[PDB]
Amino acid sequence: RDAFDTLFDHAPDKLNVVKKTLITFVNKHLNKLNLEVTELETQFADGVYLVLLMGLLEGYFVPLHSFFLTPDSFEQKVLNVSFAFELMQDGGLEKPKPRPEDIVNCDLKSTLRVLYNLFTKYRNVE
């Protein structure tokens, strides 16, 4: 159990604060690649933006041969997410709480936990 379980159970009306903050953070970076997220619920599920965001934040060039830019199956999306989780740990973040499948399945709690951990680590990156 963590603050996100308490958020959904006891303060679900504060979810907009959470999503607005995280959306603003992710777009600050994705905008540099001519990319833009308009909803956290679905737009990270295929793993592509997560991979691209990590490469950007860490200054690693992520080669296209390393992931699936246009995933066409559940398993390609799971592989993208897993690789993004790998890059997170290469950045010095701890192992994420959610399984990669939870992200692919659009579990909002899982998505928020993952983006929040990026936020807290990379909040000062211009």
């Binding site: 958020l7 903050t21 929040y116």
Partner: peptide, 15 residues
């Protein structure tokens, strides 16, 4: 940048 998110999570952790 300041964020009310930080205080929100702190308060939720305290519960």
């Amino acid at each position: 940048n300041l964020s009310e998110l930080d205080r929100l999570l702190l308060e939720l952790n305290a519960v």
